[PDB]
Amino acid sequence: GVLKIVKVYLAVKRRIQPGDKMAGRHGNKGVISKINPIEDMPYDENGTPV
Amino acid sequence: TEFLKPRLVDIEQVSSTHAKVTLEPLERGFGHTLGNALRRILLSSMPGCAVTEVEIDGVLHEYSTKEGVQEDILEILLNLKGLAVRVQGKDEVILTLNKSGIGPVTAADITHDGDVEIVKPQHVICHLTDENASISMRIKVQRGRGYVPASTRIHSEEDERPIGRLLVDACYSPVERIAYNVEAARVEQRTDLDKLVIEMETNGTIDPEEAIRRAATILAEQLEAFVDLR
Amino acid sequence: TEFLKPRLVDIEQVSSTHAKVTLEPLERGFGHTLGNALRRILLSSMPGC
C-alpha cells in the first residue's frame, strides 16, 4: 500500500525554566519555581553570587 | 541638613578586567545605601557590545559539522559569545574572518574595522586541523544591554529570514562580578565616615570610571520621577 | 541606553500620617533598587527634632 515515505528530523534547543524537574544524587528532587535575576541572588563577601 | 557629597578618589586598575575604586567621604550609612543600589544597576542595566548574528559559508545550521574543523558549529558560536569587542563609532558592525591552514584561529585573525578594537586578540574561536581547510564567516556585533537570547529574537521582527544566519545568545552586559566593601576612612576627626571600595570585574573595555558614571546616571534619572513628580 | 522612567501613579493618602504610593512602570530589579535605597534614607537620614 505504501508508495513512498519522507522522514523529517527536527532539532530543538530547550533551556531550563520553571516547572522543569531537577535533582542531586542523594534522592533530593525539586521543581524550579523561579528564575531570579543575578542582582537578587545571595552573594558572598567576595562578590560571587550563588 | 548637614549635606556631604563624596568624590571619586582612587581608580586602581589592577587589570583591564579587574578594577578597585575607592570613594570618600560618605556620611554614615550611605556606604551600604549607595553600595548596594549601585551594585544592582551595575549588574543589570550596563550597556556593552556582543555577537548577535553569525554567517559561516557552507553552514546551513548550528548543529552541523564543518570538515577540517575540530569544533562543531555550536562550540564555535559559544566562543563568539565570549568574544571581547569594543566598537567606537557605530552601534552595529559586521566583521569578516577569512583564515586557512593548520592553525588555532584567534580573535586577531578577524579583519579589524577602523573603529573596532578586539580586546583579547589571543581569544580562541576555532581549531583548523586540515591545512587545505579554509573558514570564512561574517560576525555581526551589535551594541545593547543585559541578556538578549536568540529565542526572544526569533519571535519579534523577522521580515527578512535568510537561510544561513545563526542567532545565538549575546550577554551585552559587560559586568562579570561586582562587590562593594566598607572600611574605616580616618579623615579629619570624623572617624564614623568610612569609604566605598567597589571591586569591579568586567569583560574587555567598558572603562571602570565610565561605567560608574553611567550607573549613577541611571539612578539619578529614576529619582527624577520621585523629585519632579512629587 | 533605552532609559525607561517610572511615573508617580497613585497617592492614596489614607491619613495625613499614613500614605500608600504606587509607582510604575519600573524596569526589572529597579523595584528593590529604589525601594530599599529610599527606605534607608527615609528611616536613618531624614532630619528632625
* Ordered structural domains, chain B, with CATH: 1-47+173-230 (3.30.1360.10), 48-172 (2.170.120.12)
The C-alpha cell at B222 is 529614576
- Measured between CA atoms, the residue of chain C closest to residue B32 is C37
CB atoms within 10 A of CB B155: 8
Distance, in Å, from the CA atom of B211 to the CA atom of B200, rounded to the nearest integer, reads 10
Distance, in Å, from the CA atom of B125 to the CA atom of B142, rounded to the nearest integer, reads 18
Q: Name residue B19's amino acid.
A: A
Longest dimension (CA), chain B: 75
Distance, in Å, from the CA atom of B57 to the CA atom of A38, rounded to the nearest integer, reads 37
Return all residues near A9 (Cβ < 8 A) that are at least 6 apart.
none
- Measured between CA atoms, the residue of chain C closest to residue A37 is C29
Scan residues 14-43 of A and list those with Cβ closer than 8 Å to C. 37, 39-40
Q: Name residue C25's amino acid.
A: P
Smallest Cα distance from B130 to chain C, Å: 44
- Angle at alpha carbon of residue B21, lines to B18 and B42, rounded to 5°: 70
Q: Under a CB-based contact definition with an 8 Å cutoff, are residues B218 and B175 in contact?
A: no
Contacts of A40 in chain C (CB under 8 A): 29, 32
Contacts of B155 in chain A (CB under 8 A): none
- Measured between CA atoms, the residue of chain A closest to residue C30 is A39
Distance, in Å, from the CA atom of B182 to the CA atom of B194, rounded to the nearest integer, reads 7
DSSP state letters, B65-127: --TTBSS-HHHHHHHHHT--EEESS-SEEEEEEEEESSSEEEGGGSB--TTEEES-TT-EEEE
Half-sphere exposure at residue B199, Cβ-oriented, CA atoms within 13 angstroms? 9
Q: Name residue B180's amino acid.
A: Y
Q: Is C46 on the interface with B (CB under 8 A)?
A: no
Of A11, A15, A38, the CB nearest to B43: A38
Q: Under a CB-based contact definition with an 8 Å cutoff, are residues A13 and A21 in contact?
A: no
Structure method: X-ray
Helices (H), chain B: 30-44, 73-81, 208-227
SS3 C3: coil
Using the CB atoms, write b or e for C9-21: b if 16+ within 10 Å.
Answer: eeeeeeeeeeeee
Distance, in Å, from the CA atom of B127 to the CA atom of B176, rounded to the nearest integer, reads 27
Q: Is there a contact between C2 and B218 if contact means CB atoms under 8 Å apart?
A: no
Q: Is C22 on the interface with B (CB under 8 A)?
A: no
DSSP state letters, C13-48: -SSSS--EEEEE---TTHHHHHHHHHHHIIIII---
